[PDB]
Amino acid sequence: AMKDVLAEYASRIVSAEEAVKHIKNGERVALSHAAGVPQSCVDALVQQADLFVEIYHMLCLGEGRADFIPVFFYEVPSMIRKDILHIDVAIVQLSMPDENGYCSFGVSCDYSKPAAESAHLVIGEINRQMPYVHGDNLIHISKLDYIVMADYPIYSLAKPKIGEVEEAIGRNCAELIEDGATLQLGIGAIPDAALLFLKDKKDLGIHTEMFSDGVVELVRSGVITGKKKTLHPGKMVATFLMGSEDVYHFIDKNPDVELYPVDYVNDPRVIAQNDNMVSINSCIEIDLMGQVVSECIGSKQFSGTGGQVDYVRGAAWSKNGKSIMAIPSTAKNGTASRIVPIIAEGAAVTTLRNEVDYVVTEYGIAQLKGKSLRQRAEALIAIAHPDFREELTKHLRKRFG
Amino acid sequence: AMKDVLAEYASRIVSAEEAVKHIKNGERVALSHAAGVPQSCVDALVQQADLFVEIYHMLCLGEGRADFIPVFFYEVPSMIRKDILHIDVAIVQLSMPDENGYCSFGVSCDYSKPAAESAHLVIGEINRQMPYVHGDNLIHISKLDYIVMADYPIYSLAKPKIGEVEEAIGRNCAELIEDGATLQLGIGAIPDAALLFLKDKKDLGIHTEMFSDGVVELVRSGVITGKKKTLHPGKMVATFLMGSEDVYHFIDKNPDVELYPVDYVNDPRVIAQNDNMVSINSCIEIDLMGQVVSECIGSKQFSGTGGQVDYVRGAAWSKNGKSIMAIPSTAKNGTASRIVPIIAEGAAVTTLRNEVDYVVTEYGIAQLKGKSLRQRAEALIAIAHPDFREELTKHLRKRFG
Ligand SMILES: [Cl-]
Ligand SMILES: [Cl-]
Ligand SMILES: [Cl-]
Ligand SMILES: [Cl-]
């Protein structure tokens, strides 16, 4: 008779409902990030919602405030370890244990692993369909106070339609990426469009907050080799992953994919050790001085980690590093400009005017570093939508004659 | 007959008027920073102003915009070396050459030295009264295209009156400084008041953008020894200096004082190598989320380097590091609050809400790191002036109920 691989752990295996029962009112509960959200325990949570608690997450709910905690993404794990951001309960989704009793955090390492390593109570949701992902991404099963068994497809993303605006942006981004570059970029039409114009590039590498289908396609086609990387050569390094079922199969037990916790991956000093960084991110608006506002609302994005500034700062120390803010020139169905004379009332600046590098729209490329305020205004106006250039120019004139 | 110590260089020695004559229209001219501004050449410049040119400086003229170039202070030298910020002419004030033909940049190393090492044309203003200051702060006299001799007291500062608001702030700052701390702080009533409450501290060290009379007083009294520093032990490290004639005598040929260029001193990665950093800076306003606006206008300050964020970021990586934004709770003769519901229209954020640490007023201390937006608002309100708390609270309520 074959081995019952769950046998030894039977004592701690409980239903989702039984597990979440041990959360207490007023506690902060951290969940595995993004695609690795523990679906069975979350369902049990809403079921007992009546009785209950603060959920700590980094998602844009209603895309893609009182309790929001501004923090740099790379700083979250130390803040957790120092009890500055206290987590009473970590509900993490995990892969099946290996022979040594280690489970992988699969597609969600990020702060999810640090949370599990620090929380007073740890619930591990072991999903047969959570892939086993390499890197510093394991936890021994003995650390789990409760184990909830599951079998369900993790959250996936379909790739969005690329329009001609996104195509134009992508093509401009590709222009800035030379052979051997190490990339950080996200998901959505813009980054996908950028990757589509990289098929002629050679030996690109990945050191990124996350990647998805578009990156894997360039691995399979031989463009992204990691072969010229100066840190973790030959490896795709990330802190979390999300994409199609195909991405999740490609990464499963794939030693060329390594996840590490966010305090490693997103640390500007670690990012900087990768030569030729090109970081690509989007934002909601940028003012004529170069201040960048990037928030969940308006983003049309599932993950709101605020991790982009980590990469702007890391790229700035990378040998021949570049960061790009790649955005549609307009918003709200073309009725609003993302290049604004003044940021919106009460908006939170997320990347400082003193650190912004390249800005890219469908109308072209601006490099702001080293430009005066006049020069910056003029440079951004030329890549703004034509319908907004007149009003932007008059603010320019009011300010600088 | 004794040696004419100028003799060998006679060929390049010219009047101030003759020297500046070789600047050409449309050129960018960099001047030694702050107290080391080359006074003779500047006078000659205004005299020929008729014929003439962009002066690159980091001063707040009319305290203590089109051509302003937003940049992190520590990044300026590389931007100069990469011709991203091109300097056609460097007019630097220097000490008399030593026996080896090396002049010191005296009290202005900062970007002044990097400018002199990169500019197409270099005018050295050798002042008998510019002190010889140690550190990476020399240039061989053969690099000077013209030499202008001078003998005049460099710009000095009188220490300002400390009021009870400043005293209260200083006392709160001192509370946050433990024995063995390495300090960065500026000039003005607030930092002076802070230093006045540090007389009972032991083995403090200095790694600072600049220092002045207040720091030297604590050296002379045995509090600031540098003895517990983990970088440059026993030394006061800075990038520029300004104070009374007394400070300038104390530093002259004093090997315990070392200046280095700003790309060394202000680099967050170098700052971070000093354990127990305490960085103290002021700003114009801070909003209820923690965004910090610090500009020249309203600052009542001579130097507008924007260097403070370098130290917020460096302190964040220092072992047990702290940064403090120390400000009067009010402005404009008590008619305005520096703790605001929303930053001023068009204001430039200089330190991100995600990185602010401590905020200190005459009404107390707030630590914002790890606090939610609600918690941050409440924490800042409690240290706002009582006359503004009601209106701040109603914005709090409109936002978070
Ligand atoms: Cl830590
Ligand atoms: Cl121009
Ligand atoms: Cl350099
Ligand atoms: Cl509270």
| A50 in contact with chain B, both atoms CB, cutoff 8 A | no
Tokens of B69: 């170039």
A105 vs A14, A22, A60, A93, A97, CA distance in Å?
A: 19, 22, 21, 6, 10
Which distant-in-sequence residues (6+ apart) come within 8 Å of B8 by Cβ?
none
Q: Which residue of B67, B290, B342 is in closest CB contact with A346?
A: B342
SS3 B145: coil
- Considering the domain architecture, whether residues A75 and A168 belong to the same structural domain is answered as no
Quote the minimal CA–CA distance from B372 to chain A in Å: 4
- Nearest 10 degrees: CA dihedral of A336, A337, A340, A344? 40
Quote the minimal CA–CA distance from B184 to chain A in Å: 21
What's the gap between Cα A257 and its chain centre? 16
Q: How far apart are CA B48 and CA B19, in angstroms?
A: 11
Nearest by Cα to B385 from B328, B305, B301, B309? B328
Please identify which residue in the block is written with the tokens 């506002």: A293
- Nearest 10 degrees: CA dihedral of B104, B107, B110, B113? -20
- Considering the domain architecture, whether residues B176 and B140 belong to the same structural domain is answered as no
**Do A351 and A340 form a contact (C-beta atoms < 8 A)?**
no
**Do A154 and A127 form a contact (C-beta atoms < 8 A)?**
yes
SS3 B3: coil
Q: What ligand is nearest to the CA atom of residue A263?
A: 1
Give the phi and the psi of residue B366 in degrees, each rounded to 5.
-125, 135
Q: How far apart are CA B351 and CA B292, in angstroms?
A: 5
Smallest CA–CA distance from A367 into chain B, residue = B84
- Considering the domain architecture, whether residues A18 and A150 belong to the same structural domain is answered as yes
Q: Which residue of A68, A317, A370 is in closest CB contact with B372?
A: A68
Q: Give the CATH number, domain containing residue A239.
A: 3.30.750.70
| Cβ neighbours of A368 (radius 10 Å) | 21
Q: Give the DSSP H or E segment for B115.
A: helix B112-118
Q: How far apart are CA B343 and CA B322, in angstroms?
A: 24
Which distant-in-sequence residues (6+ apart) come within 8 Å of B398 by Cβ?
none
CA atoms within 13 A on the CB side of B218: 26
Q: Give the DSSP H or E segment for B251.
A: helix B245-251
Q: How far apart are CA B163 and CA B329, in angstroms?
A: 13
CA atoms within 13 A on the CB side of B139: 29
Contacts of B348 in chain A (CB under 8 A): 289, 291, 353
- Considering the domain architecture, whether residues A92 and A213 belong to the same structural domain is answered as no
- Single-letter residue type at A400: F
SS3 B195: helix
Q: Give the DSSP H or E segment for B207.
A: strand B205-207
Smallest CA–CA distance from B400 into chain A, residue = A66
Contacts of B323 in chain A (CB under 8 A): none
Tokens of B1: 């007959």
Quote the minimal CA–CA distance from B85 to chain A in Å: 6
Q: What is the 3-state secondary structure (H, E, C) of chain A?
A: CCCCCCHHHHHHEECHHHHHCCCCCCCEEEECCHHHCCHHHHHHHHHCCCCCCEEECCECCCCCCCCCCCCCHHHHHHHHHCCCCCCCEEEEEECCCCCCCEEECCCECCCHHHHHHHCCEEEEEEECCCCCCEECCEEEHHHCCEEEEECCCCCCCCCCCCCHHHHHHHHHHHHCCCCCCEEECCCCHHHHHHHHCCCCCCCEEEECCEECHHHHHHHHCCCECCCCCCCCCCCEEECEECCCHHHHHHHCCCCCEEECCHHHHCCHHHHCCCCCEEEEECCCEEECCCCEECCCCCCCCCECCCCHHHHHHHHHHCCCCEEEEECCCEECCCCEECEECCCCCCCCEEECCCCCCEEEECCEEEECCCCCHHHHHHHHHCCCCHHHHHHHHHHHHHHHC
- Single-letter residue type at A260: Y
**Do B153 and B129 form a contact (C-beta atoms < 8 A)?**
yes
Nearest by Cα to B349 from A356, A321, A360, A312? A356
Tokens of A95: 């892969």
* Burial label, A332 (beta-carbon count in 10 A; 0-12, 13-18, 19+): exposed
| B297 in contact with chain A, both atoms CB, cutoff 8 A | no
DSSP β-bridge partners for residue A101: none
Which distant-in-sequence residues (6+ apart) come within 8 Å of A348 by Cβ?
A70, A293, A295, B289, B291, B353
Q: Give the DSSP H or E segment for B15.
A: none
* Burial label, B88 (beta-carbon count in 10 A; 0-12, 13-18, 19+): middle
| Cβ neighbours of B28 (radius 10 Å) | 18
| B289 in contact with chain A, both atoms CB, cutoff 8 A | yes
Counted across chains A and B, CB pairs separated by less than 8 A come out at 101
Q: How far apart are CA A113 and CA A94, in angstroms?
A: 10
Q: How far apart are CA B163 and CA B169, in angstroms?
A: 10
A163 vs A186, A192, B137, CA distance in Å?
A: 17, 11, 56
Question: From the CA of A313, how far away is ligand 1's center (Å)?
Answer: 20
- Considering the domain architecture, whether residues A187 and A107 belong to the same structural domain is answered as no
Contacts of A345 in chain B (CB under 8 A): 342
Quote the radius of gyration of chain B (alpha carbons, Å): 22
**Do B87 and B119 form a contact (C-beta atoms < 8 A)?**
yes
SS3 B260: coil
- Considering the domain architecture, whether residues A167 and A187 belong to the same structural domain is answered as yes
Please identify which residue in the block is written with the tokens 């800075």: B238
- Single-letter residue type at A245: E
Residues around ion ligand 3, judged by CB within 5 A, are B 78, 81
**Would you say the C-alpha torsion B141, B146, B147, B152 has a positive or negative sign?**
negative
Which distant-in-sequence residues (6+ apart) come within 8 Å of A296 by Cβ?
A60, A61, A63, A304
Q: What share of chain B is helix, strand, coil (3-state, %, to 5)?
A: 30, 20, 50
| Resolution of the entry in angstroms | 2.0
Q: How far apart are CA B185 and CA B168, in angstroms?
A: 17
Question: From the CA of B114, how far away is ligand 3's center (Å)?
Answer: 10
- Single-letter residue type at B317: W
Q: Give the CATH number, domain containing residue B87.
A: 3.40.1080.10
B103 vs B3, B59, B115, B126, B299, CA distance in Å?
A: 18, 24, 15, 8, 34
Q: How far apart are CA B128 and CA B153, in angstroms?
A: 9
**Which one of A155, A170, A186 terminates a domain?**
A155
Determine the angle formed by the axes of helices B213-220 and B189-196, rounding to 10 degrees: 10
* Domain span at B268: 261-401
Q: What ligand is nearest to the CA atom of residue B379?
A: 4
* Burial label, B245 (beta-carbon count in 10 A; 0-12, 13-18, 19+): exposed
Residues around ion ligand 1, judged by CB within 5 A, are A 78, 81
Identify residues after which chain B is interrupted (C–N over 2.5 A): 52, 64
Quote the minimal CA–CA distance from B212 to chain A in Å: 27
Quote the radius of gyration of chain A (alpha carbons, Å): 22
SS3 B214: helix
Tokens of B331: 């402005």
- Considering the domain architecture, whether residues A353 and A329 belong to the same structural domain is answered as yes
CA angle B226, B228, B230 (to 5 degrees): 95
Which distant-in-sequence residues (6+ apart) come within 8 Å of B165 by Cβ?
B328, B329, B362
Contacts of A79 in chain B (CB under 8 A): 369-370
Nearest by Cα to B251 from B107, B136, B109? B107
DSSP β-bridge partners for residue A126: A94, A149
Please identify which residue in the block is written with the tokens 């000490």: B95
**Which one of B214, B232, B260 terminates a domain?**
B260
Q: Give the DSSP H or E segment for B103.
A: strand B102-104
Cβ of A66 within 8 Å of Cβ of B346? The answer is: no
- Considering the domain architecture, whether residues B338 and B366 belong to the same structural domain is answered as yes
Between β-strands B358-361 and B364-367, what pairing exists: parallel, antiparallel or unpaired?
Answer: antiparallel
Nearest by Cα to A77 from A11, A30, A124? A30
Count of domains for chain A: 3
* Burial label, B386 (beta-carbon count in 10 A; 0-12, 13-18, 19+): exposed
How does DSSP classify residue B161? P
Which distant-in-sequence residues (6+ apart) come within 8 Å of A302 by Cβ?
A34, A59, A60, A63, A64, A157, A242
Q: Give the CATH number, domain containing residue A267.
A: 3.40.1080.20
CA atoms within 13 A on the CB side of B184: 36
The catalytic residues of B are 209
Please identify which residue in the block is written with the tokens 């605006």: A165
**Do B383 and B363 form a contact (C-beta atoms < 8 A)?**
yes
Write b or e for each residue in A125-148: b if 16 or more Cβ atoms lie within 10 A of its Cβ, otherwise e: bbbebbbbbbbebbbebeebbbbb
**Do A267 and B313 form a contact (C-beta atoms < 8 A)?**
no
Nearest by Cα to A37 from A185, A153, A143, A159? A153
- Considering the domain architecture, whether residues A209 and A345 belong to the same structural domain is answered as no
Determine the angle formed by the axes of helices A189-196 and A164-175, rounding to 10 degrees: 50
**Which one of A196, A225, A260 terminates a domain?**
A260
**Do A185 and A196 form a contact (C-beta atoms < 8 A)?**
no
- Considering the domain architecture, whether residues B255 and B295 belong to the same structural domain is answered as no
Q: How far apart are CA B248 and CA B242, in angstroms?
A: 8
- Considering the domain architecture, whether residues A132 and A231 belong to the same structural domain is answered as no
DSSP β-bridge partners for residue A108: A240
DSSP β-bridge partners for residue A184: A279
- Considering the domain architecture, whether residues A301 and A246 belong to the same structural domain is answered as no
SS3 B213: helix
